[PDB]
């Protein structure tokens, strides 16, 4: 029945790292291009439109099996069926795509770093850092840099031979975690949570918050900042400034009363706002203008 | 009449994440009478190799895989099928990527280092799905356009015969950060310092001109200008007096109002609108100014 004999070079990978080995299966395919056989692969029957080609988008790295059967109608009316069991491997990319405004590490938090060596298993690799610690966590690494304003050099080595081979020297910048901005967490007329600029806000909506909260604008950077202490500035009949201290990240009873008896259009300020990041460093963050409405 | 066999013929048995595994599944009619001969790169494969040809990767470059498969065509005539493929050896590398740090900023040039160590820059050609990704010397420049959406950088090597996907990188497009306001002043020695609030001298307020805005970042070497601001003063009757400014400089109204303020008296800088290389105008925080 065959009308087409073809030689094929089927490699494991078309790109190999120096020192690894190129492996290719060389096979003959004697087929009948007239036929359209039923291909059941990985619990699915291929649609005739696929023309025998099975495709799967490579997602997470690992060992993926290709298992099923092929069946076609023989010339005699006897179905001819053949089972198969093959496999493919998904790897990490062998191209580094690094935005330079992103090569940074933050002191005080876990910095997940993906150290990927193609052609070598995750165990054969060893990675070290010159600033802080670089430990393993599952399929990832964790950098905890200690010296802010200095460089962090990640040194990756694989060995896989007689002499220990250097794979990559990566220089990264060490920064303190950013300073947060203060805000007042409030629920709108619908009930949805919004974060005050300041500018203008209702007193019913002010007292609902119960204090000052501190966080970053982003989303860069998913970090917790707590308000240590803050002050509220008020104004008497003599035009003098009255700075009232707060009970931590919550309004004091002296302040709470002042806000109630204040009145619409009247302005108050939140000054000397000290916030604390995971690194434990207390930091002076900016002020907010609060207008009653 | 000899045996029929199922065959899974992939493009590659190893696929990098982001690429797609492609395999042709066929019924092949194998002759069990005689074993064929596989001659590849000047060597005849021994039956023990089971069709597997292996070569140790040495110096980086383009290596060809060439040869033929010979067999008896049942008609006293030997049949030959030639094959010609190739592999690439690369300088041994490792990718060190901090996973949290995946942001591109809209409104500026985002230098991206796309490194495929073994190959040369001509060989590599990267594309982006959000904005533009152009070449600049030994680097690439992403200019993302849609804030809050994803930016997927696709790096390819193309070449003969098949087009190989090198990397698919997921990035987040975010707006440039907002700067913080400051008043630039020279101390008693002449050294420049930046006041962000708290207490400050009278003559030292008068110099410099008005308010300045900046972000402190040595990677994002961007600059912002103060568009407009207000100074909110307080009289003897406890009333708020909001005086507008002449751009990034104090107005003659504000200047004289600061002059008649006694020691300890408080005034504010709110609102404060600043724009960057974006170039987007943005409401930045306020400053409490106390006279010394
Ligand atoms: Zn290998
Ligand atoms: Zn296996
Ligand atoms: Zn039959
Ligand atoms: Zn913003």
Numbering used by the authors:
A (entry chain B): 224 to 516
B (entry chain A): 225 to 516
Paper quotes:
Full-length PorMp resisted all attempted crystallization assays. Phasing was performed using SeMet-substituted PorMp224. Domains D2 and D3 could be traced fairly easily, but domain D4 was only partially constructed due to poor electron density map. The resulting PorMp224 structure exhibits three domains that resemble GldMp domains D2–D4. Interestingly, PorMp domains D2 and D3 possess a domain-swapping motif identical to that of GldMp. Domains D3 and D4 of PorMp224 and PorMp315 share the same straight topology as those of GldM, whereas domain D2 is bent with respect to D3–D4 at an angle of ~45° because of the convolution of two rotations and a sliding of D3 monomers. The most striking difference observed between GldMp and PorMp is their overall topology, which results from the PorMp kink between D2 and D3. This kink is the result of two rotations around a vertical axis and around a horizontal axis, as in a cardan mount. Of note, the PorMp D2–D3 bending movement can occur in the left or the right direction, leading to two non-superimposable structures.
PorM (or GldM) is therefore a central structural component of the T9SS and an interesting target for structure and function studies. Finally, we suggest that due to the structural similarity between PorM and GldM, both classical T9SS and Gld T9SS membrane core complexes might assemble and function in similar ways.
